[PDB]
Amino acid sequence: YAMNVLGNDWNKAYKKSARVVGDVIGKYHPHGDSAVYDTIVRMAQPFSL
DNA sequence: AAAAAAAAAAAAAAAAAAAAAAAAAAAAAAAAAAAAAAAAAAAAAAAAAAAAAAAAAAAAAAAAAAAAAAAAAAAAAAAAAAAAAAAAAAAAAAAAAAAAAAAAAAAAAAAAAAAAAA
């Protein structure tokens, strides 16, 4: 939801993980940046999902 | 073959550390002035020594400041309670010599392989 609200569309330039993690922690998910970045990393990997 | 403990998966909680770059301070370790202390020379004020002397303890005795007695009154110091400072007694400890177990080099000799001769 945070990535969709920011505008990280599949046909647009990449945004840094720091910005997305900061937006998620600030707005929606108050549980520390390291876990959120680990979830983003696992979602991005081609051998996990 | 039963019990027990490690480890790994992924979203969660919470931490820790190494360097660069300049300018100032603070420890901490050195050369190097600078003065005590000590060994070994010559040198020179003090004790000795003697004769010669006269200044202060004895002695008479008055008298004038005195130390014990009496009294009143003020209140310093001593011993008993508590409450802090500061030092030996005893025990503990981190590196540190001693011992024991695993990694790397060593060649003796042979299995398997590669290569070529007639």
Short mmCIF file of all heavy atoms in Angstrom, two decimals, chain B residues 100-114:
data_model
loop_
_atom_site.label_atom_id
_atom_site.label_comp_id
_atom_site.label_asym_id
_atom_site.label_seq_id
_atom_site.Cartn_x
_atom_site.Cartn_y
_atom_site.Cartn_z
P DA B 100 51.87 -34.52 29.31
OP1 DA B 100 51.44 -35.70 30.09
OP2 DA B 100 53.16 -34.54 28.59
"O5'" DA B 100 50.72 -34.16 28.24
"C5'" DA B 100 49.36 -34.04 28.66
"C4'" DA B 100 48.46 -33.65 27.51
"O4'" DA B 100 48.82 -32.31 27.03
"C3'" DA B 100 48.53 -34.56 26.28
"O3'" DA B 100 47.23 -34.77 25.73
"C2'" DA B 100 49.44 -33.78 25.34
"C1'" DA B 100 49.02 -32.36 25.63
N9 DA B 100 49.98 -31.33 25.26
C8 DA B 100 51.29 -31.22 25.67
N7 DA B 100 51.91 -30.18 25.18
C5 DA B 100 50.97 -29.56 24.38
C6 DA B 100 51.01 -28.38 23.59
N6 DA B 100 52.10 -27.60 23.48
N1 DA B 100 49.90 -28.03 22.91
C2 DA B 100 48.81 -28.81 23.03
N3 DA B 100 48.64 -29.93 23.75
C4 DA B 100 49.77 -30.25 24.41
P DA B 101 46.99 -35.81 24.53
OP1 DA B 101 45.91 -36.74 24.95
OP2 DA B 101 48.31 -36.35 24.13
"O5'" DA B 101 46.45 -34.91 23.33
"C5'" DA B 101 45.15 -34.32 23.40
"C4'" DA B 101 44.84 -33.51 22.15
"O4'" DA B 101 45.84 -32.46 22.00
"C3'" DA B 101 44.86 -34.30 20.84
"O3'" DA B 101 43.90 -33.77 19.92
"C2'" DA B 101 46.29 -34.10 20.37
"C1'" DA B 101 46.55 -32.65 20.78
N9 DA B 101 47.95 -32.30 21.02
C8 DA B 101 48.86 -32.97 21.79
N7 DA B 101 50.04 -32.40 21.83
C5 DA B 101 49.91 -31.28 21.02
C6 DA B 101 50.82 -30.26 20.65
N6 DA B 101 52.08 -30.20 21.08
N1 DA B 101 50.37 -29.28 19.82
C2 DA B 101 49.10 -29.34 19.40
N3 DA B 101 48.15 -30.25 19.68
C4 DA B 101 48.63 -31.20 20.51
P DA B 102 43.59 -34.53 18.54
OP1 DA B 102 42.12 -34.74 18.47
OP2 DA B 102 44.50 -35.69 18.44
"O5'" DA B 102 44.02 -33.48 17.41
"C5'" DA B 102 43.20 -32.34 17.13
"C4'" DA B 102 43.91 -31.35 16.23
"O4'" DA B 102 45.22 -31.05 16.79
"C3'" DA B 102 44.17 -31.83 14.80
"O3'" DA B 102 44.02 -30.76 13.86
"C2'" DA B 102 45.60 -32.33 14.88
"C1'" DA B 102 46.21 -31.30 15.81
N9 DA B 102 47.44 -31.72 16.47
C8 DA B 102 47.63 -32.83 17.27
N7 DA B 102 48.84 -32.94 17.73
C5 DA B 102 49.52 -31.85 17.20
C6 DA B 102 50.86 -31.40 17.33
N6 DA B 102 51.78 -32.03 18.07
N1 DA B 102 51.21 -30.27 16.68
C2 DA B 102 50.28 -29.63 15.95
N3 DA B 102 48.99 -29.95 15.76
C4 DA B 102 48.67 -31.09 16.42
P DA B 103 44.03 -31.04 12.28
OP1 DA B 103 42.75 -30.56 11.74
OP2 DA B 103 44.43 -32.45 12.07
"O5'" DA B 103 45.21 -30.10 11.72
"C5'" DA B 103 45.01 -28.68 11.63
"C4'" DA B 103 46.22 -27.99 11.01
"O4'" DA B 103 47.40 -28.31 11.79
"C3'" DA B 103 46.54 -28.40 9.58
"O3'" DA B 103 47.12 -27.30 8.86
"C2'" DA B 103 47.53 -29.54 9.78
"C1'" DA B 103 48.30 -29.09 11.01
N9 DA B 103 48.81 -30.17 11.87
C8 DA B 103 48.10 -31.20 12.42
N7 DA B 103 48.83 -32.00 13.16
C5 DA B 103 50.11 -31.48 13.08
C6 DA B 103 51.34 -31.88 13.66
N6 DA B 103 51.47 -32.94 14.46
N1 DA B 103 52.44 -31.13 13.38
C2 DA B 103 52.30 -30.06 12.59
N3 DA B 103 51.20 -29.58 12.00
C4 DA B 103 50.12 -30.34 12.29
P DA B 104 47.35 -27.39 7.27
OP1 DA B 104 46.98 -26.08 6.69
OP2 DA B 104 46.69 -28.63 6.79
"O5'" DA B 104 48.93 -27.60 7.11
"C5'" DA B 104 49.81 -26.51 7.37
"C4'" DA B 104 51.26 -26.94 7.21
"O4'" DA B 104 51.56 -28.01 8.16
"C3'" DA B 104 51.62 -27.50 5.83
"O3'" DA B 104 52.90 -27.02 5.41
"C2'" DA B 104 51.62 -29.00 6.05
"C1'" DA B 104 52.16 -29.09 7.48
N9 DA B 104 51.88 -30.31 8.22
C8 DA B 104 50.66 -30.93 8.36
N7 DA B 104 50.70 -32.00 9.10
C5 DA B 104 52.04 -32.11 9.48
C6 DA B 104 52.73 -33.05 10.29
N6 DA B 104 52.14 -34.09 10.89
N1 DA B 104 54.06 -32.87 10.47
C2 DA B 104 54.65 -31.82 9.89
N3 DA B 104 54.10 -30.87 9.11
C4 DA B 104 52.78 -31.07 8.95
P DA B 105 53.39 -27.22 3.89
OP1 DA B 105 53.85 -25.90 3.40
OP2 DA B 105 52.33 -27.94 3.16
"O5'" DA B 105 54.64 -28.20 4.01
"C5'" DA B 105 55.87 -27.74 4.56
"C4'" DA B 105 56.79 -28.90 4.89
"O4'" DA B 105 56.10 -29.82 5.77
"C3'" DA B 105 57.26 -29.72 3.68
"O3'" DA B 105 58.69 -29.81 3.64
"C2'" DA B 105 56.59 -31.08 3.87
"C1'" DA B 105 56.36 -31.14 5.38
N9 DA B 105 55.28 -31.97 5.82
C8 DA B 105 53.95 -31.81 5.51
N7 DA B 105 53.17 -32.70 6.05
C5 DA B 105 54.02 -33.52 6.77
C6 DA B 105 53.80 -34.66 7.59
N6 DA B 105 52.58 -35.18 7.82
N1 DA B 105 54.87 -35.25 8.17
C2 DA B 105 56.08 -34.73 7.95
N3 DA B 105 56.42 -33.65 7.21
C4 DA B 105 55.33 -33.09 6.64
P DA B 106 59.44 -30.40 2.35
OP1 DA B 106 60.77 -29.75 2.29
OP2 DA B 106 58.53 -30.31 1.19
"O5'" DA B 106 59.64 -31.95 2.69
"C5'" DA B 106 60.47 -32.33 3.79
"C4'" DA B 106 60.23 -33.78 4.17
"O4'" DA B 106 58.85 -33.97 4.56
"C3'" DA B 106 60.49 -34.80 3.04
"O3'" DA B 106 61.61 -35.63 3.35
"C2'" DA B 106 59.18 -35.61 2.97
"C1'" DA B 106 58.50 -35.29 4.28
N9 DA B 106 57.08 -35.41 4.26
C8 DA B 106 56.19 -34.64 3.57
N7 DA B 106 54.94 -34.98 3.74
C5 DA B 106 55.00 -36.07 4.60
C6 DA B 106 54.00 -36.89 5.18
N6 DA B 106 52.69 -36.72 4.96
N1 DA B 106 54.39 -37.89 6.00
C2 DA B 106 55.70 -38.05 6.23
N3 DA B 106 56.74 -37.34 5.75
C4 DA B 106 56.31 -36.35 4.93
P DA B 107 63.05 -35.32 2.70
OP1 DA B 107 64.01 -36.30 3.25
OP2 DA B 107 63.30 -33.87 2.86
"O5'" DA B 107 62.86 -35.62 1.14
"C5'" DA B 107 63.26 -36.88 0.59
"C4'" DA B 107 62.42 -38.01 1.15
"O4'" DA B 107 61.06 -37.55 1.32
"C3'" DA B 107 62.33 -39.28 0.28
"O3'" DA B 107 62.99 -40.39 0.91
"C2'" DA B 107 60.83 -39.53 0.11
"C1'" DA B 107 60.18 -38.63 1.16
N9 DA B 107 58.90 -38.14 0.79
C8 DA B 107 58.64 -37.06 -0.02
N7 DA B 107 57.37 -36.84 -0.20
C5 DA B 107 56.73 -37.83 0.54
C6 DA B 107 55.36 -38.13 0.77
N6 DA B 107 54.36 -37.42 0.25
N1 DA B 107 55.07 -39.19 1.55
C2 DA B 107 56.08 -39.90 2.08
N3 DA B 107 57.40 -39.71 1.95
C4 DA B 107 57.67 -38.65 1.16
P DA B 108 63.81 -41.45 0.02
OP1 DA B 108 65.25 -41.13 0.17
OP2 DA B 108 63.20 -41.49 -1.33
"O5'" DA B 108 63.52 -42.87 0.72
"C5'" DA B 108 62.22 -43.15 1.23
"C4'" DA B 108 61.85 -44.62 1.09
"O4'" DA B 108 60.41 -44.75 1.30
"C3'" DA B 108 62.09 -45.26 -0.28
"O3'" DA B 108 62.25 -46.69 -0.15
"C2'" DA B 108 60.83 -44.87 -1.03
"C1'" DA B 108 59.75 -44.97 0.06
N9 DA B 108 58.63 -44.05 -0.02
C8 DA B 108 58.72 -42.69 -0.19
N7 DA B 108 57.56 -42.09 -0.23
C5 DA B 108 56.63 -43.12 -0.07
C6 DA B 108 55.21 -43.13 -0.01
N6 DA B 108 54.46 -42.03 -0.10
N1 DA B 108 54.60 -44.32 0.15
C2 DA B 108 55.35 -45.42 0.25
N3 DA B 108 56.69 -45.54 0.22
C4 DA B 108 57.28 -44.34 0.05
P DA B 109 62.55 -47.60 -1.44
OP1 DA B 109 63.20 -48.85 -0.97
OP2 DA B 109 63.24 -46.75 -2.44
"O5'" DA B 109 61.09 -47.96 -2.02
"C5'" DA B 109 60.14 -48.63 -1.18
"C4'" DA B 109 58.76 -48.70 -1.83
"O4'" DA B 109 58.11 -47.40 -1.76
"C3'" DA B 109 58.74 -49.10 -3.31
"O3'" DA B 109 57.84 -50.20 -3.49
"C2'" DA B 109 58.28 -47.83 -4.03
"C1'" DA B 109 57.43 -47.15 -2.97
N9 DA B 109 57.26 -45.71 -3.11
C8 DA B 109 58.25 -44.76 -3.19
N7 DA B 109 57.80 -43.53 -3.27
C5 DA B 109 56.41 -43.67 -3.25
C6 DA B 109 55.35 -42.73 -3.30
N6 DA B 109 55.55 -41.41 -3.37
N1 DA B 109 54.09 -43.20 -3.26
C2 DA B 109 53.90 -44.52 -3.17
N3 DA B 109 54.81 -45.51 -3.11
C4 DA B 109 56.06 -45.01 -3.15
P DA B 110 57.70 -50.94 -4.91
OP1 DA B 110 57.91 -52.39 -4.69
OP2 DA B 110 58.54 -50.21 -5.89
"O5'" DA B 110 56.17 -50.71 -5.31
"C5'" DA B 110 55.13 -51.01 -4.38
"C4'" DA B 110 53.79 -50.50 -4.87
"O4'" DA B 110 53.78 -49.04 -4.84
"C3'" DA B 110 53.43 -50.88 -6.30
"O3'" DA B 110 52.01 -51.06 -6.42
"C2'" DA B 110 53.92 -49.67 -7.08
"C1'" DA B 110 53.49 -48.54 -6.13
N9 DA B 110 54.15 -47.26 -6.28
C8 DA B 110 55.50 -47.02 -6.44
N7 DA B 110 55.80 -45.75 -6.52
C5 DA B 110 54.59 -45.10 -6.41
C6 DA B 110 54.24 -43.72 -6.41
N6 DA B 110 55.13 -42.73 -6.53
N1 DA B 110 52.93 -43.40 -6.29
C2 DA B 110 52.04 -44.39 -6.16
N3 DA B 110 52.24 -45.72 -6.13
C4 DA B 110 53.55 -46.01 -6.27
P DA B 111 51.39 -51.83 -7.69
OP1 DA B 111 50.98 -53.18 -7.23
OP2 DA B 111 52.33 -51.70 -8.82
"O5'" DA B 111 50.07 -50.99 -8.04
"C5'" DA B 111 49.17 -50.60 -7.01
"C4'" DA B 111 48.05 -49.72 -7.55
"O4'" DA B 111 48.53 -48.36 -7.67
"C3'" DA B 111 47.53 -50.11 -8.93
"O3'" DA B 111 46.12 -49.91 -9.02
"C2'" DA B 111 48.31 -49.22 -9.89
"C1'" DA B 111 48.72 -48.00 -9.03
N9 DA B 111 50.12 -47.55 -9.16
C8 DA B 111 51.25 -48.33 -9.16
N7 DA B 111 52.36 -47.65 -9.27
C5 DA B 111 51.95 -46.33 -9.35
C6 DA B 111 52.66 -45.11 -9.46
N6 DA B 111 54.00 -45.04 -9.51
N1 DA B 111 51.95 -43.96 -9.52
C2 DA B 111 50.62 -44.03 -9.45
N3 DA B 111 49.83 -45.12 -9.33
C4 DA B 111 50.57 -46.25 -9.29
P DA B 112 45.29 -50.43 -10.30
OP1 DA B 112 43.91 -50.69 -9.86
OP2 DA B 112 46.07 -51.51 -10.94
"O5'" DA B 112 45.30 -49.18 -11.29
"C5'" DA B 112 44.70 -47.95 -10.88
"C4'" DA B 112 45.19 -46.78 -11.73
"O4'" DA B 112 46.61 -46.57 -11.50
"C3'" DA B 112 45.05 -46.97 -13.24
"O3'" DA B 112 43.97 -46.17 -13.74
"C2'" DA B 112 46.41 -46.55 -13.82
"C1'" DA B 112 47.16 -45.96 -12.63
N9 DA B 112 48.60 -46.22 -12.65
C8 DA B 112 49.22 -47.43 -12.53
N7 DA B 112 50.53 -47.36 -12.57
C5 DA B 112 50.79 -46.00 -12.72
C6 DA B 112 52.01 -45.27 -12.82
N6 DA B 112 53.22 -45.84 -12.76
N1 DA B 112 51.93 -43.93 -12.97
C2 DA B 112 50.71 -43.37 -13.01
N3 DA B 112 49.50 -43.95 -12.92
C4 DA B 112 49.62 -45.28 -12.78
P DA B 113 43.52 -46.27 -15.29
OP1 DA B 113 42.10 -45.84 -15.37
OP2 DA B 113 43.92 -47.59 -15.80
"O5'" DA B 113 44.42 -45.17 -16.02
"C5'" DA B 113 44.44 -43.82 -15.54
"C4'" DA B 113 45.64 -43.06 -16.07
"O4'" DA B 113 46.86 -43.68 -15.59
"C3'" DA B 113 45.78 -43.04 -17.59
"O3'" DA B 113 45.27 -41.82 -18.11
"C2'" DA B 113 47.29 -43.21 -17.85
"C1'" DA B 113 47.90 -43.32 -16.45
N9 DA B 113 48.93 -44.28 -16.36
C8 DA B 113 48.78 -45.63 -16.16
N7 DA B 113 49.91 -46.29 -16.11
C5 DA B 113 50.88 -45.32 -16.30
C6 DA B 113 52.30 -45.38 -16.34
N6 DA B 113 53.00 -46.51 -16.18
N1 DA B 113 52.98 -44.22 -16.54
C2 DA B 113 52.28 -43.09 -16.68
N3 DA B 113 50.95 -42.90 -16.65
C4 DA B 113 50.30 -44.07 -16.45
P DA B 114 45.09 -41.62 -19.70
OP1 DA B 114 44.12 -40.53 -19.90
OP2 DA B 114 44.84 -42.95 -20.31
"O5'" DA B 114 46.53 -41.13 -20.19
"C5'" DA B 114 47.12 -39.97 -19.61
"C4'" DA B 114 48.50 -39.73 -20.17
"O4'" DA B 114 49.40 -40.76 -19.68
"C3'" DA B 114 48.58 -39.77 -21.70
"O3'" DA B 114 49.18 -38.57 -22.20
"C2'" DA B 114 49.42 -41.01 -22.01
"C1'" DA B 114 50.21 -41.23 -20.73
N9 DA B 114 50.53 -42.63 -20.47
C8 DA B 114 49.65 -43.64 -20.19
N7 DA B 114 50.22 -44.80 -20.00
C5 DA B 114 51.58 -44.55 -20.17
C6 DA B 114 52.72 -45.39 -20.10
N6 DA B 114 52.67 -46.69 -19.80
N1 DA B 114 53.93 -44.83 -20.33
C2 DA B 114 53.99 -43.52 -20.61
N3 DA B 114 52.98 -42.63 -20.70
C4 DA B 114 51.79 -43.22 -20.47
#
